[PDB]
Every structure is written in C-alpha cells, then in structure tokens.
C-alpha cells in the first residue's frame, strides 16, 4: 500500500491490451471483500473495466477471505482457466495476476489438514511443491500463445527460506519490488531500480546493447548510492570532476526512470506515456553517454521518451 | 442490526485468541485433524468469516456501518505465530503495543512505526490531516536518527534538530486513560508542537504544558475550537489566533 | 540457542551496529575539519592510537604541533575503526537472523511432530 500497487497493476493491463492486443485476468486469492469492491470501482473509474460497452480489458475472479479453504484453494486455477482461453483459443498474450500467491499455498495447507494428512516441515502440506507446480507450470508460452503471471508475494516472518516463499521462487523469472521510499521521492512508478531483478537480464538474451545499458544504469545507481553517505556528512564538495558527474547523471537517471501512466490520467491531469523498448535503451544510453549533461534534473521528471526530456527543458527555460 | 438499519455500530472482540483456543479444544475433542499449534485446518476461516461481517454499506443499503476492533494477544512479541498471523492478514491494519515502550513511559504503548491503517487519511478529517501529515513525517525522520541521541557526542544541528522535534512530538503522543479527546482539541495540541512552539520547551514539561494549555482553550477559547470543528480545518485566521494563544500562554508558562 | 537468547544478541547487535555507524559519521566530520586545519600547521575507541604512543613511550610552538597532528590521526583512526565495527555488526545481524529463522522453523516443526505423534498413538 501507499506504493502504486493497484495503479501499476492497471497500467500493465492497459499496456497489454494496447501493445499486444492481449487481455488480462485478475485472480484474488483470499481477497478482503472490502478491497475487492474497491478494486472494482477503481478499475472502472480508470476504464480497464467498462460497464456500458464491451471494451473491458480485464476479467475478475474472486476468492474472498470468508470462503472455505477449498474455494480459496481453487480460485487461482479458475482464473487460470480463464486466461488459458485467451491463449489456447485466440492465441493472445494474456496476463495473469494472482493476489496473493501466499494465500494460495495457505489455502492448500488448510485443505490438506482437513484431509487429515500429516503436515510437513513448518506445518505446510506434504504436497507443497506439487500443489504449486501443477499450477505454475500451466503458465507458459506454448506454440499457440502465452500466459504471463504477476504474482503478489507475501513472505512469512520475513524469512526468504521459509518453505512457502522458497518453493515459490523456484518458478519466478523476475521480481518487481514496489518501494515506499522511492514513492517518497515522488518517483512513480515506485519500482526500485536496484532491488528489482530479472532472469532474462542476460546479454545472451536481451542483447549486448540492452544488457550493457542496463548494467550501466545500475552501476551508476549503485555508485551514487555510495556517495550518498558522504554528501550529507562531509558536504557535497570533495567530489571530483568525475564524482560530480556520476551524481548529476545518476540524479537524472533516477528521474528518467519515473513515468506518467495513462491509467492515472483521470485525475493526474497529465497525459500517460507508453515508452517503447527502443526508446528506453536509447534514452538511458545517451544520459550515460553524457549527451544531456547540460540538461537539468527536473527536465527528466515524469516524461516519456528522452525527446520529452528535451522539450521539458525548453519550457523550463 | 444497527449496520443494516442506517445506523453505525462499533464492536470489540476481546480476545480472538481465547476464542481460537475454545474452537481448538472442540475440534481436537471431536478428533478432527490437528495442524500447526494443534489448530484445525479451518481456524483461519473461523475468523475471516467473522471479521468480514464488518463493513461500510452503500446508501442504497442504508449507509449504516459496523467497525471492528478485534483483539489478539501475542506471545513474546511473536506476531508471526499462527493466530496472530491470520488476523493480521485479515484486518485493514494493526495497532502494535510494546512493553518496552510502556515501561519507557510511552503510554499508550503504541509502536507508531509498526502500526498501520490501510484505510488511512480516507478516514481522517481535513483538520487532522492538516497536522497529522507533518507529524507523521518528523516522527519517521526521528525514528531514523533516534538511536544516535544517547551517543551524539557531536551531531550537526541538522539532525540535532530532528532529535528535538522527535522527543517533543513523542511527548505529545502520550496520554492518560479514560480521557478521550475531541478531534478539535487534538489538533490544537498537535499544532503546538508541530509548528515548533514546544521546541525550546523542556521535554520534562510537554505533558504539563498540554494539560494546562488544553485546559485553557477548552475554558477560554471554545469559539476557536468550535470554528476548527465546524470549518473542519485550520483557517488562515484561526491559525493566527492559535499563534497568539500559544505564544502568550507559553510566555506565561515559563515565568 | 533459544529464540529468546538469539533475540537478545540480535536486539543488541542491531543497536551496536547503529551506534558504531553513527560514530563514524562523526569521526569523518571532525576529520574533514582536521585535514584542512592540518594544512597550515605543518608549515610550522580510536584504533591503535593511545596504545601506539603508550608502548613506544617506554614548547608551545611544538606543543601545538604534536597536538594539531595527534587529532588528525585520532579522528582518522576512530573513523575507520567505527567503519569496520559496523561492518562487523552487519555481518552479525545477517548471520544471527539466519540462525533465528532456522530455529524459528525448527521449533514449529518439532511441535507439530509431537502433536501428530501423540494423536497417531490413540
């Protein structure tokens, strides 16, 4: 919460419909009735849902918290079935959202216990891994299309090695870490550029260019992080002609990484931006490059493609 | 009955821990299968089905509501134990109390950092937000530095400032029992520290100050509070009136 | 180990780490000041400071010298020392949390096994 979780969930939906003509499903595993209804009207107000026409880009599946273990146990599958259709029948690129993946597992244990089976380590189900795999595995790219799943994860006891979370990681291809701190910088989406990771971030997969840029943005982001401590204490000045550029750039970078969502136009009074991968690499490429060193920070805040960074500077004298 | 009939009702479950135990006892005696902590597989369900019944209806239904304050008793602060885990996971937030805090003098022992309200400001009045917002911020900022105090052999005046704001605001949060205040009284007091009026005051006096200050305004200034209440916020006017009211009172105070 | 025991150390080492970290920021500050004030003067827990002189130990014009020096060296030493102390404390917080979670889990399993064991004997 506080961090743009729903808004981000809604932009993705939008962007999937837009750039891939793919639809989305939303599976609420153990949803709080209050929160469901709130999600409903939120989607609506943002368009993703349309009660008047036939322009809705999402289907909603709900397994409320009051429902018995078995129901909260299946709801994810149900949602799965739905998504599978937009892939196996119409070969699109669906989006699957499971909120939250933990409640799935938990629902599993409850059913298990009821079936009188002996729990395993930490009380989970003896079938923990299977329960998970028979589900996760349906989420892939077949020849017909592909289902992509955004799973909301809840780590128990902050223990990454807890059986529940641990099991789950066995199936994740990437993490998207929303951060309250980032949000505090006014930066949105509030995604953490250093904590968020992807398995495909391999030059062998994204290509040397993409791979290098990424690895570039990150290091700078890392370096600046170091200096952060110095700046505040010993004051921003023992900084070299070099140390002063890493900062400047980084600061521009941090901002260039923020962005206006079309979902949030309704009352942000700002037009959304759906930056293209090509435009994305280019943008960061240049900042790294030093092409816009003359440009000022605020120029990059909440824009789309670098071109906008340039124009914003204009309007900023 | 209230909820459904356009009315508003508050409910306190004290505790859900004991109830869970009652249920467990029955389950095991009936010989149903035991899970972690010997709890049946449907203990989560027992609470979820309970706690969901509370809700805010639509005018179409009467606009009536049912708010719930369920109590959970942790053990050695283990919020992650079984039953605490469920309920935490079911509710819209938590008010976390600590013994350390309590004994340290913070009463109520609310651990501000760890407590939450998913609903948030959507439930705060404009008046409160008008003050709550900056308070929340300096506190969070203090929380970052707090540990330094006791060894701050030479901190800059930047952070040294947040240490001060920190302890004062903290003192403002203290409270006696059986004496719940009106939203207008709370903002008036909060405003004092938040604006910086108590910064130069002695930490040992904030409790006394508030007491007396609030006695004064409740006595003398029932028109401003009425305003604050009514206008729902702190008008530029009432704001100025408060400035004088505290600046003069303070003066009086340190005679 | 006892979760109550590990919680103690953890509780504490968490503190020691923040203190220690705080002391360095200080030590860096004074040390900044010192490097500057040092400049001119030459044209005239603190690491292994007090000891180094101590061991080897068995006006004004120079008094201000040994002084103006012995403070750069000190504020230097304290800084690096506290830098590594928290570096240590961090390795520890990370290490202890690991033991915490192993135990935490183990405790749960051990209980559950006990239950199951007694139930199955009826």
């Amino acid at each position: 919460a506080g961090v743009g979780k729903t808004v981000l969930i809604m932009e993705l939906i939008n962007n999937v419909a837009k750039a891939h003509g793919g639809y989305s499903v939303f599976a609420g595993v153990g949803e709080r009735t209050r929160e469901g209804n709130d999600l409903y009207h939120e989607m609506i107000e943002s368009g993703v849902i349309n009660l008047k026409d036939a322009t809705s880009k999402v289907a909603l599946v709900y397994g409320q918290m009051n429902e018995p273990p078995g129901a909260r146990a299946r709801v994810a599958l149900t949602g799965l079935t739905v998504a599978e259709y937009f892939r196996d029948q119409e070969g699109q690129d669906v989006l699957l959202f499971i909120d939250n993946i933990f409640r799935f597992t938990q629902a599993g244990s409850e059913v298990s216990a009821l079936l009188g089976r002996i729990p395993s380590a930490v009380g989970y189900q003896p079938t923990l891994a299977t329960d998970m795999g028979t589900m996760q595995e349906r989420i892939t790219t077949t020849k017909k299309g592909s289902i992509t799943s955004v799973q909301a994860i809840y780590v128990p006891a902050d223990d990454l090695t807890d059986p529940a979370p641990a099991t789950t990681f066995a199936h994740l291809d990437a993490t998207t870490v929303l951060s309250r701190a980032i949000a505090e910088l006014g930066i949105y989406p509030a995604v953490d550029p250093l904590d968020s990771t992807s398995r495909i971030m391999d030059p062998n997969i994204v290509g040397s260019e993409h791979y290098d840029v990424a690895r570039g943005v990150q290091k700078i982001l890392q370096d600046y992080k170091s200096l952060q401590d110095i700046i505040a204490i010993l004051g921003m000045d023992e900084l070299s002609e070099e140390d002063k550029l890493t900062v400047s750039r980084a600061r521009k970078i941090q901002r260039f990484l923020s962005q206006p969502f079309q979902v949030a136009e309704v009352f942000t009074g700002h037009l959304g931006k759906l930056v293209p991968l090509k435009e994305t690499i280019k943008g960061f490429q240049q900042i790294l490059a030093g092409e816009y060193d003359h440009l000022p920070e605020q120029a990059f805040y909440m824009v789309g493609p670098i071109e906008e960074a340039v124009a914003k500077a204009d309007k900023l004298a | 009955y209230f909820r459904d009939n356009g009315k508003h009702a508050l409910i306190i479950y004290d505790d859900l821990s004991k109830q869970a135990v009652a249920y467990r006892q029955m389950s095991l005696l009936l010989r149903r299968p035991p899970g972690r902590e010997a709890y049946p597989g449907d203990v989560f369900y027992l609470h979820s089905r309970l706690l969901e019944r509370a809700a805010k209806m639509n005018d179409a239904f009467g606009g009536g509501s049912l708010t719930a304050l369920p109590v959970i008793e942790t053990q050695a602060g283990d919020v992650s134990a079984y039953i605490p885990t469920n309920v935490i996971s079911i509710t819209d937030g938590q008010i976390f109390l600590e013994t350390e805090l309590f004994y340290k003098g913070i009463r109520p022992a609310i651990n501000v950092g760890l407590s939450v309200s998913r609903v948030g400001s959507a439930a705060q009045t404009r008046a409160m937000k008008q003050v709550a917002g900056t308070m929340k911020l300096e506190l969070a900022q203090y929380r970052e530095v707090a540990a330094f105090a006791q060894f701050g052999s030479d901190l800059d005046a930047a952070t040294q400032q947040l240490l001060s704001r920190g302890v004062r605001l903290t003192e403002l949060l203290k409270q006696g029992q059986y004496s719940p205040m009106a939203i207008e009284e709370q903002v008036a007091v909060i405003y004092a520290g938040v604006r910086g009026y108590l910064d130069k005051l002695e930490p040992s006096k904030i409790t006394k100050f508030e007491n007396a200050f609030l006695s004064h305004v409740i006595s003398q200034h029932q028109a401003l509070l009425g305003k604050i209440r009514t206008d729902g916020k702190i008008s530029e006017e009432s704001d100025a009136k408060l400035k004088e009211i505290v600046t003069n009172f303070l003066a009086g105070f340190e005679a | 180990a006892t979760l109550k025991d590990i919680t103690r150390r953890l509780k504490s080492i968490k503190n020691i780490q923040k203190i220690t970290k705080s002391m360095k920021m200080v030590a860096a500050a004074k040390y900044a000041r010192a490097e500057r004030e040092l400049k001119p003067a030459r044209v005239y827990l603190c690491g292994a400071i007090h000891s180094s002189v101590a061991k080897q130990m068995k006006l004004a014009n120079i008094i201000y010298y040994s002084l103006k020096e012995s403070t750069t060296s000190e504020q230097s030493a304290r800084m690096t020392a506290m830098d590594n102390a928290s570096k240590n404390a961090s390795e520890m917080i990370d290490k202890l949390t690991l033991t915490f979670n192993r135990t935490r889990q183990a405790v749960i399993t051990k209980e559950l096994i006990e239950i199951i064991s007694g139930a199955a004997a009826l």
């Binding site: 870490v177 | 942790t74 283990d78 976390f96 | -």
Partner: peptide, 15 residues
C-alpha cells in the same frame, strides 16, 4: 525477530 514481520518484504532484492 518476533515482530519483524511489520518492516516487510525487507530483504526482497535478494530473492
């Protein structure tokens, strides 16, 4: 320890 779970997703960039 005991109430850590009220931080949360804290070591997330490690997963």
């Amino acid at each position: 320890x005991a109430x850590a779970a009220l931080x949360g997703a804290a070591x997330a960039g490690l997963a």
